[PDB]
Amino acid sequence: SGFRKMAFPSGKVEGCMVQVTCGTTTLNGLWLDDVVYCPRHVICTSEDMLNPNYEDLLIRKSNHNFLVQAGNVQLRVIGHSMQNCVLKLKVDTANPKTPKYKFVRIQPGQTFSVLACYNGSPSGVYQCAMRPNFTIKGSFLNGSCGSVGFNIDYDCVSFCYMHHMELPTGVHAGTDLEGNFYGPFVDRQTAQAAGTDTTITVNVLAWLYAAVINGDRWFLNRFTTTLNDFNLVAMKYNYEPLTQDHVDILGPLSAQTGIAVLDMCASLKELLQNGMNGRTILGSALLEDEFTPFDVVRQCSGVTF
Amino acid sequence: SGFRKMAFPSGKVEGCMVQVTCGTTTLNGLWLDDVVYCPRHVICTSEDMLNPNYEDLLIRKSNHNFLVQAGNVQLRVIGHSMQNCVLKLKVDTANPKTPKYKFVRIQPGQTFSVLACYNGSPSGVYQCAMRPNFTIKGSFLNGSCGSVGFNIDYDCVSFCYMHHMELPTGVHAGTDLEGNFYGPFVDRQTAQAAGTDTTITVNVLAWLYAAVINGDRWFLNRFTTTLNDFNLVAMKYNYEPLTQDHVDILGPLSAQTGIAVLDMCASLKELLQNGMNGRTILGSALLEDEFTPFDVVRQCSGVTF
Ligand SMILES: *CCN[P@](=O)(NCCBr)OCc1cnc(N(O)O)n1C
Numbered sequence: 124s125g126f127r128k129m130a131f132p133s134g135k136v137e138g139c140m141v142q143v144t145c146g147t148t149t150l151n152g153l154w155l156d157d158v159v160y161c162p163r164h165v166i167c168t169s170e171d172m173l174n175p176n177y178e179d180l181l182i183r184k185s186n187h188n189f190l191v192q193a194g195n196v197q198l199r200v201i202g203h204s205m206q207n208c209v210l211k212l213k214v215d216t217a218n219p220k221t222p223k224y225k226f227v228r229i230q231p232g233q234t235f236s237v238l239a240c241y242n243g244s245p246s247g248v249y250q251c252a253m254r255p256n257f258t259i260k261g262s263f264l265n266g267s268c269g270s271v272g273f274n275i276d277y278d279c280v281s282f283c284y285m286h287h288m289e290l291p292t293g294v295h296a297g298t299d300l301e302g303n304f305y306g307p308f309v310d311r312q313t314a315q316a317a318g319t320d321t322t323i324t325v326n327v328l329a330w331l332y333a334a335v336i337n338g339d340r341w342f343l344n345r346f347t348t349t350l351n352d353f354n355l356v357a358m359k360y361n362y363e364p365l366t367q368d369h370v371d372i373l374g375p376l377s378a379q380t381g382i383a384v385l386d387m388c389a390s391l392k393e394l395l396q397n398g399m400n401g402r403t404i405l406g407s408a409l410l411e412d413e414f415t416p417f418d419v420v421r422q423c424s425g426v427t428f
Numbered sequence: 429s430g431f432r433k434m435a436f437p438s439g440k441v442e443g444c445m446v447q448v449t450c451g452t453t454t455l456n457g458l459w460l461d462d463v464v465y466c467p468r469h470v471i472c473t474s475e476d477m478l479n480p481n482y483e484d485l486l487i488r489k490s491n492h493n494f495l496v497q498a499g500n501v502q503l504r505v506i507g508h509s510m511q512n513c514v515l516k517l518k519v520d521t522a523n524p525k526t527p528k529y530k531f532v533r534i535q536p537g538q539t540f541s542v543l544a545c546y547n548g549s550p551s552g553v554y555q556c557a558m559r560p561n562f563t564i565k566g567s568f569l570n571g572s573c574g575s576v577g578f579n580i581d582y583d584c585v586s587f588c589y590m591h592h593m594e595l596p597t598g599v600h601a602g603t604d605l606e607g608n609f610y611g612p613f614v615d616r617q618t619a620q621a622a623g624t625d626t627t628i629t630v631n632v633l634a635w636l637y638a639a640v641i642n643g644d645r646w647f648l649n650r651f652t653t654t655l656n657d658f659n660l661v662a663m664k665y666n667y668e669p670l671t672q673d674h675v676d677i678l679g680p681l682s683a684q685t686g687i688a689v690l691d692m693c694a695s696l697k698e699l700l701q702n703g704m705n706g707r708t709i710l711g712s713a714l715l716e717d718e719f720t721p722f723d724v725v726r727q728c729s730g731v732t733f
Pocket residue numbers: 164172263264265266267268269286287288289309310311312313429
C-alpha cells in the first residue's frame with residue numbers, strides 16, 4: 124500500500140528526445156518515425172517575441188538552418204513545414220526507437236507525465252494535470268521548451284502536451300502535438316493572464332477514495348448530500364461543479380470501498396467548510412486534485428506497461 | 429520556473445528489470461551484467477514468513493528452480509548465492525542494456541527515485557527519501573517486491589534501495605544492493621515498529637530556498653537566530669538537529685538568494701511556532717522535507733543526464 128504522485132516510466136519517450144537549434148535558439152524536439160516536432164518559436168530572436176509573424180519569419184529558413192541532434196549524432200533535415208504552432212522537420216532517418224504512439228488532445232482535469240529536457244537530454248519526470256484554466260503547474264527552466272507530456276496505455280504512448288512558454292505568474296502553457304494551444308494562449312511575449320484556477324472536484328473525490336483504501340479514514344462522517352446541494356458548496360470554494368458523468372466515473376471506487384459517491388461528497392463538503400483542523404490526508408494538508416479516478420484505480424491495482 | 433517533486437528519468441533502469449519466480453512466488457529482480465539481484469524471501473512460502481531460516485530453505489533450491497524472465501525471453505541461471513538479504517542469480521547472458529552503475533548505501537535524509545514494478549514490468553516512477561527512522565514512504569502493491577531506488581549522476585546509475593516489505597503501519601523497508609537492511613528491520617513477518625518519523629530539517633530549508641527562487645516569499649521575516657536556539661525549537665517539533673555541516677551544505681543556496689542560512693532558520697522557526705495560517709508554499713500547506721539541497725540546485729539549474 125501507500126499512495127504517491129506517480130509518473131509513467133519515461134524510457135519510451137527518452138528515446139524520442141532530440142535537440143533542435145535554429146540560429147541562436149536551442150530547445151527540444153520529439154522524434155517519431157521520420158519527423159521531428161518542436162515549437163515554432165525556435166525560429167524567433169528574443170526581439171521577434173514582442174510581435175512575431177511566423178509565416179514571414181519562416182521564409183528566411185531552409186532545411187539546413189534547422190540543426191537536429193540526437194545524442195551525439197546529427198540528423199539530416201529534408202523538409203520542414205508549420206502546423207499551427209509547431210514545426211515538423213522531416214529527417215532522412217526513422218527513429219529506430221519510435222514506440223507505438225498516438226496524438227491526443229486531453230480535456231481539463233486529465234493528468235499526464237512530463238519528461239523535462241534541456242538540449243535534447245532528459246532531466247526529470249513528474250506528473251501534471253491540465254488545469255480548468257488550461258494552464259499546467261510544471262517545472263520548466265530555460266532550454267526546457269519542447270518537453271512533452273504523455274500517457275502510456277500498456278505499450279502505446281499517447282502524447283498530449285508540448286511545452287512552449289511560461290506566463291508572468293509562473294504557470295505554463297503549451298500545445299497538443301498538432302500545435303494547437305490549450306486554452307486561449309498564443310506564442311507571443313505579451314499580456315495574457317490565466318483565469319481562475321478552479322479545483323478539479325472529481326479528482327479530489329478519487330483521492331479521498333484512495334485515502335480510504337490506504338487507511339486514512341478520519342474524514343468520513345455520518346452525512347450525505349445531493350449533487351445540487353454539494354454544488355452550492357463547490358461554487359463558493361471555486362470547485363468544478365460535479366455532474367452525473369463524474370458520479371458514474373467514480374462508480375468503481377464507490378464499489379471497491381462501499382462508500383456511496385454522495386456520502387464522500389458530504390465528507391468533502393465538511394472538509395471545505397471546516398478545513399483539516401491541522402490533520403493530514405495521505406501526507407497532504409490540502410485537498411489534492413491531480414489524481415484522476417483512473418489514476419487511483421491504476422495505482423491501487425498495479426497496472427504495468 | 430516552477431518547482432515539482434521530480435524523479436530521475438527511468439529508462440536506464442527499465443532496461444534492467446526482470447521477473448523472478450521461485451515456486452509460487454513472483455517478484456522483481458535487477459539484471460546488471462550477468463547477475464540478477466532479488467530479495468531472498470522469493471524462496472519463502474507464506475507460512476515460512478513467521479520464522480524463516482534462509483540457509484535451510486536454500487538447501488532445497490537449485491539453479492533451475494529460479495525462473496528468470498526478461499520481457500518475453502527466459503534467462504538461463506547458472507549459479508546462485510545469498511548475500512545478506514538478497515539473492516544473486518548468475519545468468520549465462522550479460523544484460524545488453526546494462527548502464528554504467530554503482531551500488532551505494534545512502535544516509536537518512538538523502539533522496540532517490542523508485543521505479544515501481546510488477547512481474548518485471550514497470551508501473552510508475554516517484555521520488556522518495558530515506559527517513560530518519562530508516563523507512564521510506566512509497567507505493568508498493570503485491571508483486572512490487574524487488575523494485576529498486578536509484579540516483580543518476582550524468583550517465584551512471586547509483587542503486588541504493590531494493591524493496592522488501594511493508595510494515596503494519598503502511599510504511600516500507602528494504603535493503604541496499606548488498607542485501608543489508610536500512611535500519612533495524614528484518615525479513616520476517618513479525619512485530620517490528622518504526623521509530624519517530626523526524627523531519628529532515630536541512631531539506632525543509634533547501635525547499636524554502638527553492639520557494640524564494642520561485643516567487644513564494646511571504647514567509648521571510650525580519651528575524652535571525654542561532655544554531656543552538658533554533659535547535660531548541662527543532663527538538664520540540666521532532667525536527668532533526670541542524671549542524672554546521674548542514675549550514676555549509678546550504679551555502680550555495682544562501683549565495684544565490686542572498687538570504688543567510690540562519691535568517692532562513694528564523695523563518696522556519698516562526699513557521700513551526702505559528703503555522704502557515706492557511707497559506708501555501710510551492711503549492712503545499714505543510715513543510716516539505718524530501719528535497720535535498722542538491723535536488724534544489726539541480727532542478728533550479730537544469731542538470732541533464
Ligand atoms: C520553453 C519556454 N521558452 P522561453 O523563451 N525561456 C524559458 C522561460 Br523559464 O519562455 C518564454 C517564451 C518562449 N516563447 C514564448 N512565447 O511563445 O510568447 N514565451 C513567452
